[PDB]
Amino acid sequence: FGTNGFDIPTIAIALLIVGVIIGLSGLILSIFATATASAISNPSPGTLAYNLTHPLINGMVSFFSFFPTLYVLLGVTGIVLIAAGIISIIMEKF
Amino acid sequence: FGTNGFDIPTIAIALLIVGVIIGLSGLILSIFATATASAISNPSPGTLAYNLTHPLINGMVSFFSFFPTLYVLLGVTGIVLIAAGIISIIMEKF
Amino acid sequence: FGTNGFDIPTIAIALLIVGVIIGLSGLILSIFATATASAISNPSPGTLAYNLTHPLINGMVSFFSFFPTLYVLLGVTGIVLIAAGIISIIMEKF
Amino acid sequence: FGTNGFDIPTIAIALLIVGVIIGLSGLILSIFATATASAISNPSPGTLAYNLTHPLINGMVSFFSFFPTLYVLLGVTGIVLIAAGIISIIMEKF
Amino acid sequence: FGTNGFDIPTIAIALLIVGVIIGLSGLILSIFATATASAISNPSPGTLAYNLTHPLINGMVSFFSFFPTLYVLLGVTGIVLIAAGIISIIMEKF
Amino acid sequence: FGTNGFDIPTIAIALLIVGVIIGLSGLILSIFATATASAISNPSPGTLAYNLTHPLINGMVSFFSFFPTLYVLLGVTGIVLIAAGIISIIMEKF
Amino acid sequence: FGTNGFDIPTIAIALLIVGVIIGLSGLILSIFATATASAISNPSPGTLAYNLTHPLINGMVSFFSFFPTLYVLLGVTGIVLIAAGIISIIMEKF
């Protein structure tokens, strides 16, 4: 059901695959994040360990704050792909 | 249905193609613009980041304000093409 | 849909491409500018580090202030291109 | 989207590249300047070390004061390039 | 529809072409003039930059004031051409 | 639309070209003049640097004051050209 | 847009070039003059070094005082060139 490489069943299967992979990634990352949160403690505001540890958790927070826009762009990619398929169909179907 | 290169079915198909392409372009650009709007924040009116970032968004605004007249001219082009076709038909059909 | 090299679908696609590229450029530059703003500190008004660092940020500010007019000219270019296309069509379509 | 060597997407990409490179340069230079400021001390106003060290920091200050106009000229260059492109388009598009 | 080189359809097409070209010229020049107006600032009445910049804008104003009569003469030319055509027709049609 | 070398479309295009070139020249010169104004300082009224620098800025001022009449003459040239065209048309059109 | 070698666009470009070159010359000379002023000191009014150095700075002052009239003549040259162009056009355009 297509012309050259555009197949609606294949597209649906690909959507299934990406959806389930993203679900698993969220699940695993959340589960691991809980363990990390449990492991690290809060020594004191101003001792040696605080100086030694604070920037690390800051980097954690920053990278994880970067995740959402990555996911948004990844989602945007699929609309582009499907639209390219539609245009390609229309171009030489007539 | 024509004389040399003017074909009414071909013209209708071309109109279909340009219409759908313009629709897709609007869709994709709007969706991406929402993501850009979400990503960038407003630091402060007068700090370093404001000086560093404000002209960029100004350029964004300006270019996107230039878009409408581009679209208008692009639309005007088709009337010229169809009129040239009509004249060419009349010239040597009689 | 054209005469020699003027194709309305091609023009629309080109507009799409330039628009999305400009959006990405704004996004990336803003995100990076936030990081730069965070990294650099303000030592003091009159110490060695101030003398060492101030002109650099001045150059930053100046170049980024130059960006907007660059974008404006870049936008102006497209109107010229489309108008040249219209004129070329009219010249030998009749 | 151009005539011979003028490509609006290429220009936008080039602007992106120069912008990010300038941002990185500012970042790295500022970070290094902080370290230099920290390392050197102020011995005394009139001892041997002062005589030995003062002109060096004077040269530092002078060169870094030269930076801003370099950046300004570098920014001016792009407007010239884009204008040359516009003129070249207009010359033989008609 | 003519005698030797006078063709009413050709004349009408030529009028169309000159009209649209003049419209485009006005459009482009106005759009560019807005950008120029935005870019240049007003430093002060009596400093170095004022002395350096004022005559340039004076020349701008003068040349652009010369434009109108150029356009008027250009318009006058067409009446002469059409009248020459009429006379040439009458001379040897009888 | 002409007789030998006088073409109203060509004239209009030439007017467009000269107008845009003059606009760009004004823009670039003003932008550069601002940078020059910023770079040079005012040392003192009577020291060595004043003697060394004052005549240079005097020459700057003088040449830039010469610009306006150059532009005026350049503008006058076009009226002469168009009038020569009109006369040439009238001479042998009848 | 001309007759043999007189081209208004070429003239405008030449004016741009000479203007920017003169601006750069003023800039560079002023910047260098500041450095020269800083380097040389004032030993004493009547010692050996004064006798050894004074005439040199006198020659500096004199030559730099000669600059302005050079610039004025250079500016005058362009009016002559443009007028020669106008006369040449008028001579054989009719």
Interface test with F, best of E8, E48, E67 (most F CBs within 10 A): E48
Cβ contact F12–E22 (<8 Å)? yes
- Measured CA to CA, the distance from residue F10 to residue F16 in angstroms comes to 10
Rounded Cα distance, A48 and G10, in Å: 72
* Eight-state DSSP code of residue D2: -
> How many Cβ pairs within 8 Å bridge chains A and B?
28
Indicate yes or no: CB of B24 within 8 angstroms of CB of A83.
yes
Residue type, C37: A
Q: Give B 40-69 residues with CB within 8 A of chain A.
A: none
What resolution in angstroms does the PDB record give?
3.8
Cβ–Cβ contacts within 10 Å for residue A90, how many? 14
User: After which residues does a break in chain E occur, C–N more than 2.5 Å?
Assistant: none
- Six-digit token pair at E47? 């400093």
For residue A20 the two structure tokens come to 């389930």
Closest partner CB to B32 (pick from A76, A87, A90): A76
Whether E73 contacts F83, CB under 8 Å: yes
Neighbours of A80 (CB within 10 A): 15
Residue F34 token pair: 């601002």
Beta-carbon contacts of residue A79 (< 8 Å; ≥ 6 apart)? B27, B28, B31
Burial class of residue G62, CB neighbours in 10 A (0-12, 13-18, 19+): exposed
Please write down the HEC assignment for all residues of D44-57: CCCCHHHHHHHHHH
Query: Minimal CA–CA distance to F11: which of E85, G85, D94?
Result: D94
- Please tell me the distance from the alpha carbon of residue E65 to that of residue E57, in angstroms, as a whole number: 12
Is E63:G12 a contact under the CB 8 Å cutoff?
no
Give the burial class of G45: count Cβ atoms within 10 A of its Cβ; 0-12 exposed, 13-18 middle, 19 or more buried: exposed
The total number of residues written for chain A in this structure: 94
Whether the CB-CB separation of G93 and G87 falls below 8 Å is answered with no
CB contact under 8 A, E60 and F12: no
Q: Which of A69, A86, A94 sits opposite B13 (nearest CB)?
A: A94
Is the CB of residue G23 less than 8 Å from the CB of residue F29?
A: yes
G75 close contact with F: CB closer than 8 A: yes
Query: Can you tell me the distance from the alpha carbon of G18 to that of G16, in angstroms, rounded to the nearest whole number?
Result: 6
**Which subunits sit against F, judged by 3+ Cβ pairs under 8 A?**
D, E, G
Q: Is C19's CB within 8 Å of B39's CB?
A: no
Identify the DSSP state of A62.
H
Using CB atoms, which residue from D20, D31, D83 is nearest to C39? D31
Q: Which chains touch D (3 or more CB pairs under 8 A)?
A: C, F
Distance of CA C1 to the CA centre of its chain: 30
In D73-93, which positions are buried (b, 16+ CB within 10 angstroms) versus exposed (e)?
Answer: eebbebbeebbebbeebbeee
Nearest to E13 by CA among A54, C92, F60: C92
Q: Are E53 and F38 in contact (CB under 8 A)?
A: no
Handedness of CA E63, E69, E72, E77 (dihedral sign): negative
Are F15 and F78 spatial neighbours (Cβ–Cβ below 8 Å)?
yes
Q: Which amino acid is at F58?
A: N
Nearest to A1 by CA among A85, A83, A94: A85
Experimental technique, in short, is cryo-EM
DSSP single-letter state for residue E6: -
Judged by CB atoms closer than 8 Å, whether chains meet at D79 and F16 is answered as: no
- D-chain residues near C8 (CB < 8 A): none
Spatial distance between the Cα atoms of D53 and D55, rounded to a whole number of angstroms: 6
CA F86 to chain E, closest CA, distance in angstroms equals 6
Task: Give residues with Cβ within 8 angstroms of E76, minimum separation 6.
Answer: F86
- Which tokens sit at E9? 């359809």
Interface check E33 vs C, CB under 8 A:
no
Distance CA B58, CA B42 (A): 14
Both tokens assigned to E79: 């009446």
Segment 9-28 of chain D within 8 Å of chain C by CB: 9, 11-13, 15-16, 19-20, 22-23, 26-27
Q: Compute the distance between CA of residue F86 and CA of residue B65 in angstroms, rounded to an integer.
A: 42
Task: Tell me the DSSP string of E12-59.
Answer: HHHHHHHHHHHHHHHHHHHHHHHHHHHH-----SSSHHHHHHHHHHHH
Minimal CA–CA distance to E52: which of G31, D71, F26, G17? Answer: F26
Q: Which member of D22, D27, D90 has the closest CB to residue C63?
A: D22
Question: Helix or strand or coil: residue D81?
Answer: helix
Residue length of chain G: 94
Query: What are residue G6's phi and psi, to 5 degrees?
Result: -90, 115
In sequence order, the 6+-apart residues with CB closer than 8 A to the CB of F21 are D87, G9, G12, G13, G16
Contact D69 F13 (CB under 8 A): no
Residue C58, burial from CB neighbour count under 10 angstroms (0-12, 13-18, 19+): middle
How many angstroms separate the Cα of B27 from the Cα of each of B23, B34, B61, E30, G12? 6, 11, 18, 31, 45
C-alpha atoms less than 13 angstroms from C-alpha of F52 in its C-beta half-sphere: 24
Q: Residue D22 in contact with residue C63, Cβ under 8 Å? A: yes
